[PDB]
Design a protein around this nucleic acid. Structure first.
Ligand SMILES: [Mg+2]
Ligand SMILES: [Mg+2]
Ligand SMILES: [Mg+2]
Ligand SMILES: [Zn+2]
Lengths: 151, 66, 114, 101, 82
RNA sequence: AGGGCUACACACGUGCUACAAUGGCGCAUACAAAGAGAAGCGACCUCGCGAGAGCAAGCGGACCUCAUAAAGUGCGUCGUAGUCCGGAUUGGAGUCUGCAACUCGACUCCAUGAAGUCGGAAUCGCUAGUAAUCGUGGAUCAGAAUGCCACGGUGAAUACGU
């Protein structure tokens, strides 16, 4: 869009728990058009979350979110002199976007026996700040703040 | 002849589908099962398939069209 | 384990660890396990030696292992020997069942060395 | 227009409809299981192949009527895509009109 | 392959020339353009000259050479390598 | 009339299938849309694991056939293995159409079942029911599609900006 600013598509809230953020997490977790299995695995993993870290779904999910909530990020751009990444602020919507993306991509790996097991693994380890999600969060927090050439 | 260098020349059996059994010596060792002989052979005898020399009566039957 | 001159694995469903025998896939696996009368989801370590002998003298009916090997070997050998088109296809190491070769004949030809 | 191929085609359709209903039952001798004998069925096949191979209805190429093109044929119109499209544009193809949905 | 309910296949000219030859043949070459005919157990001992596109390559009919076609033993393309 | 366009030290372009648990298999269970059909579709029925074969009503069709949609849903099974992933290749036994399946058809059964652990440089498509995946049908057509065209089932991501 050279002359447009196309707003974000409006999402429905997850009819099970009211959380639209989780409904978006489902799609971000969804692959191949299989939304039935996506909602199945996400609900199962939230159950496992509540029963593993005690705190219920709509709280452990958030604490797993902020604990990886990305602050800033570098982005490729050039205006003159040389090519270099530039640290830029990621919007709150883009913040929890990157959070959900990192979380689901992590949960897709470390697969041992089940989807909900590995998903709750990553969720809890993110909340406690020892997962790989938080390791990539730390890397993004180091990379961005390693260089702040210009504001 | 010499020893320890020449092959073994045991007396074996030459049994062909002709049904003739000949007692030949050779470097074969085992009972030898043959296909055609001085008897029951095209050149030697008038019968084209002679007798036996191939039980291919086997699949002709499966299709059996005159 | 000793059935079929082979050492079929253990702690695996009987339908499945019966497949480790040349000459038996999953159809003949179920077929022998039924014609001999054995449950499907019993692991190999869940089988007694009487049922093992039952498998010994039941799978016998289907030719298997070394014997089939020899059979297919002599089959392709008579192919080569007869002087047929398929015999030459076998000698060259090319598709024999009528595939394309200008490209995609890899399983037979082998990977791209030259 | 290479009327040699079109003469081949007309001769093939003529001879296919000529010895039609002969090879029809000569093939019916062969699909029934009560071929009385191998000879009933077997002798039929030989007689079938005595009948001109140029009188089979599989030998026809079904070429377009105006131009005799082998490819692009359409059993609805009897014309190649080119001739059918020019006729469709000129209106000589009834009921036909550029589709859009 | 060919359906069993229909039987085997051999062109009439080939079948009849083969009979006229099995009775009276000492390899007076029989040249067959038919490569699709099947090999009958009555052709054992023959070496029919079957076409391959330009040349009548001969094929000696043997016992094991029964359940295949005359074209099976007449290659058609001459490949040697690059 | 025969063979070739199907040749094959090789390189590239499209496309399919996969490398697996969001998955493989078994059982049961539901939801389409569109079209074609008369020298065609062909119900049922009987025989054949199966390809189909015999039987054959009805249908020139909002009436009869294709034709069961599949993904899905619940149960259990497989437990991260070149494997119960794959399914190339090859041997044997068939079915179908056609004068005829050797070159050189399709499919079916049985049998080992290979590469393949997500892919170098680079590079393609897509802004909403669209990508992605699932299946369906038509043309051509005696037989022969993963292509083409058409149809529906689930169904997302991000567009800050130049
Ligand atoms: Mg001495
Ligand atoms: Mg060709
Ligand atoms: Mg646009
Ligand atoms: Zn003899």
């Amino acid at each position: 869009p050279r002359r447009r600013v196309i707003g974000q598509r409006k999402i429905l809230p997850d009819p099970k728990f009211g959380s639209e953020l989780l409904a978006k997490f489902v799609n971000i977790l969804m692959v191949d058009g299989k939304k039935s299995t996506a909602e199945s695995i996400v609900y199962s993993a939230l159950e496992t979350l509540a029963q593993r870290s005690g705190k219920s779904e709509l709280e452990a999910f958030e604490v797993a979110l902020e604990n990886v909530r990305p602050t800033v990020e570098v982005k490729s751009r050039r205006v003159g002199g040389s090519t270099y990444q530039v640290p830029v602020e990621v919007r709150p919507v883009r913040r929890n976007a990157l959070a959900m993306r990192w979380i689901v991509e992590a949960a897709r790996k470390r697969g041992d026996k089940s989807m909900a097991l590995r998903l709750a693994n990553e969720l809890s380890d993110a909340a406690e700040n020892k997962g790989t999600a938080v390791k990539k969060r730390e890397d993004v927090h180091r990379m961005a703040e390693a260089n702040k050439a210009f504001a | 002849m010499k020893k320890d260098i020449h092959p073994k020349y045991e007396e074996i059996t030459a049994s062909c589908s002709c049904g003739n059994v000949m007692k030949i010596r050779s470097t074969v060792g085992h009972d030898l099962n043959l296909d055609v002989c001085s008897k029951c052979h095209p050149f030697f005898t008038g019968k084209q398939r002679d007798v036996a020399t191939g039980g291919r009566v086997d699949r002709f039957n499966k299709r059996f069209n005159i | 384990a000793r059935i079929a001159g082979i050492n079929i694995p253990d702690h695996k469903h009987a339908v499945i660890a019966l497949t480790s025998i040349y000459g038996v896939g999953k159809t003949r696996s179920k077929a022998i396990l039924a014609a001999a009368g054995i449950a499907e989801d019993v692991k190999i370590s869940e089988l007694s030696e009487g049922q093992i002998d039952t498998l010994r003298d039941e799978v016998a009916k289907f030719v298997v292992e070394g014997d089939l090997r020899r059979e297919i070997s002599m089959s392709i050998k008579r192919l080569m020997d007869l002087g047929c088109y398929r015999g030459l296809r076998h000698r060259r190491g090319l598709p024999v069942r009528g595939q394309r070769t200008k490209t995609n004949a890899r399983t037979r030809k082998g990977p791209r060395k030259p | 227009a290479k009327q040699s191929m079109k003469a081949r085609e007309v001769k093939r359709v003529a001879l296919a409809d000529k010895y039609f209903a002969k090879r029809a039952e000569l093939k019916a001798i062969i699909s029934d299981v009560n071929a009385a004998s191998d000879e009933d069925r077997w002798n039929a096949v030989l007689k079938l192949q005595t009948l001109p191979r140029d009188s089979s209805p599989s030998r026809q190429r079904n070429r377009c009527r105006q131009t005799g093109r082998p490819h692009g044929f359409l059993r609805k119109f009897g014309l190649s895509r080119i001739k059918v499209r020019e006729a469709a544009m000129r209106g000589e193809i009834p009921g036909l009109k550029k589709a859009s949905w | 392959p060919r359906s069993l309910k229909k039987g085997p296949f051999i062109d009439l000219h080939l079948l009849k020339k083969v009979e006229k030859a099995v009775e009276s043949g000492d390899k007076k070459p029989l040249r067959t353009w038919s490569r699709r005919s099947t090999i009958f157990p009555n052709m054992i001992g023959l070496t029919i000259a079957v076409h391959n596109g330009r040349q009548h390559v001969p094929v000696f009919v043997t016992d094991e050479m029964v359940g295949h076609k005359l074209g099976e033993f007449a290659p058609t393309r001459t490949y040697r390598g690059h």
